[PDB]
């Protein structure tokens, strides 16, 4: 679909068997989800945003459905205030800022 930006670009995602809402975020290199129960092994990572840094867990090769489009990639899990879908997954669903 085409999505305009008068409101937050929120979409429905399915990940780890669970349904969540997340913001399509072109300003985010990586994908960051609030604390959730994911199955696999993870690695420590620290990521920086506008007000400082947070500790997250890095999960690779995670299947996520984003507004009906399947993608597999890295998902970071930790104390983000909002679920954000970053460019790493946006490119997979063919998302652009486009005409």
Positions touching ligand 52U (CB under 6 A) are 25, 27-30, 32, 47-50, 81-82, 84, 86
Binding of a copy of itself by 83 (CB under 8 A): no
Question: Given the rule CB under 8 A, which of 12-20, 37-45, 57-65, 83-91 is the region that contacts a copy of itself?
Answer: 83-91
If we measure between CA atoms, which residue out of 54, 49, 63 comes closest to residue 93? 63
Residues 61-70 as b/e (b if ≥16 CB within 10 A, e otherwise) read ebebebbeee
Subset of 4-33 contacting a copy of itself (CB under 8 A):
4-6, 8-9, 23-29, 32
Closest contact distance (angstroms) between CB of 11 and ligand 52U is 14
If we measure between CA atoms, which residue out of 92, 98, 78, 82 comes closest to residue 23? 82
Closest contact distance (angstroms) between CB of 8 and a copy of itself is 7
If we measure between CA atoms, which residue out of 15, 9, 53, 8 comes closest to residue 33? 15
Residue closer to ligand 52U by CB (options 7, 17) is 7
| CB-based contact 86:25 (threshold 8 Å) | yes
């Amino acid at each position: 679909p085409q999505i305009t930006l008068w409101q937050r670009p929120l979409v429905t995602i399915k990940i780890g068997g669970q349904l969540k809402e997340a913001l399509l975020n072109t300003g985010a290199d990586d994908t960051v989800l609030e604390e959730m129960s994911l199955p696999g092994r993870w690695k420590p990572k620290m990521i920086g945003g506008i007000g400082g840094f947070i500790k997250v867990r890095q999960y690779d090769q995670i299947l996520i459905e984003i507004c009906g489009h399947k993608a597999i990639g890295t998902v970071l899990v930790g104390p983000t205030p909002v679920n954000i879908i970053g460019r790493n997954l946006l490119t997979q669903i063919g998302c652009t800022l486009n005409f």
